[PDB]
């Protein structure tokens, strides 16, 4: 590894993100004045548990699909074997989405962008998972305080995805070398932009692991109560990543 190569990797990672960020930051920022009304919130609260879950499961799948395209565009990711690629995406995709979510979260009124408008925690009351929603809202609130940039999210998410500590990796050292280069790339950007201060302020080791395990646990409660709802109305990719291997992620990696 060399300096100008690490300098190229920073450009390679920010371009990958810029292309697959789903929604531009300004589009999210200009819609912050477009908040859900008291009557509009009540409507979501009056919706059935399974209809709210179906909508959330879809929006989360929409979000993950861009993370899968971001993965494919990452430097070195496609050089890894199909096993390692799936291993990393199965563990990473939901963590990356929760990191990216802080862009759609407005710290001032404590609201999040959802279905064209900004709404508080109460908009998801029908899901019957109060704790998880408040956990997701607080996490977004912590990353908001960090005053992140788009370039910073790009390099940080790339690191969240390329973790050599995931079980199931056959070519571990190949992931270890890519993780290292990406680590140096992120640290070099922070050093250049005089933003190394955020390193101590970043989320703890398994903070994101807690939100994902909470998300899988809260889904298993819903799947027990409504098994046919999940079988018939939930997105196939969502079921492969969170219900229980099916070969949907392989179809996404093989093409494009
Ligand atoms: C992720 N990329 S982005 O450009 O930042 C971006 C961000 C947001 C949106 C539109 N909002 C959402 O997708 C959304 C917002 N808030 C949520 O909850 C806090 C969501 C969302 C999707 N699933 N969930 C959710 C997850 C787990 C759960 F148990 C219940 C709901 C579009 C695009």
UniProtKB/Swiss-Prot annotation:
Location relative to the cell: Nucleus
Mutagenesis / variant outcome for changing residue 63 to F: Completely abolishes transcriptional activity
Tissues expressing this chain: Isoform 1 is widely expressed in many tissues, including liver and adipose, and highly expressed in skeletal muscle. Isoform 2 is primarily expressed in immature thymocytes.
Motif (AF-2): 237-242
Positions of the NR LBD domain: 5-243
Induction of its expression: Up-regulated in the state of obesity.
Known role: Nuclear receptor that binds DNA as a monomer to ROR response elements (RORE) containing a single core motif half-site 5'-AGGTCA-3' preceded by a short A-T-rich sequence. Key regulator of cellular differentiation, immunity, peripheral circadian rhythm as well as lipid, steroid, xenobiotics and glucose metabolism. Considered to have intrinsic transcriptional activity, have some natural ligands like oxysterols that act as agonists (25-hydroxycholesterol) or inverse agonists (7-oxygenated sterols), enhancing or repressing the transcriptional activity, respectively.
Binding partners and assembly: Interacts (via AF-2 motif) with the coactivator NCOA2 (via LXXLL motif). Interacts with the corepressor NCOR1. Interacts with CRY1. Interacts (via AF-2 motif) with the coactivators NCOA1 and PPARGC1A (via LXXLL motif). Interacts (via AF-2 motif) with PROX1. Interacts with FOXP3. Interacts with NR0B2.
Domain description: The AF-2 (activation function-2) motif is required for recruiting coregulators containing LXXLL motifs such as NCOA1 and NCOA2.
Disease per UniProt entry: Immunodeficiency 42: An autosomal recessive primary immunodeficiency characterized by increased susceptibility to concomitant candidiasis and mycobacteriosis. Candidiasis is characterized by persistent and/or recurrent infections of the skin, nails and mucous membranes caused by organisms of the genus Candida. Mycobacteriosis is characterized by infections caused by moderately virulent mycobacterial species, such as Bacillus Calmette-Guerin (BCG) vaccine, environmental non-tuberculous mycobacteria, and by the more virulent Mycobacterium tuberculosis.
Family from the record: Belongs to the nuclear hormone receptor family. NR1 subfamily.
Annotated protein name in UniProt: Nuclear receptor ROR-gamma
Entire protein: shown range: 265 to 507 of 518
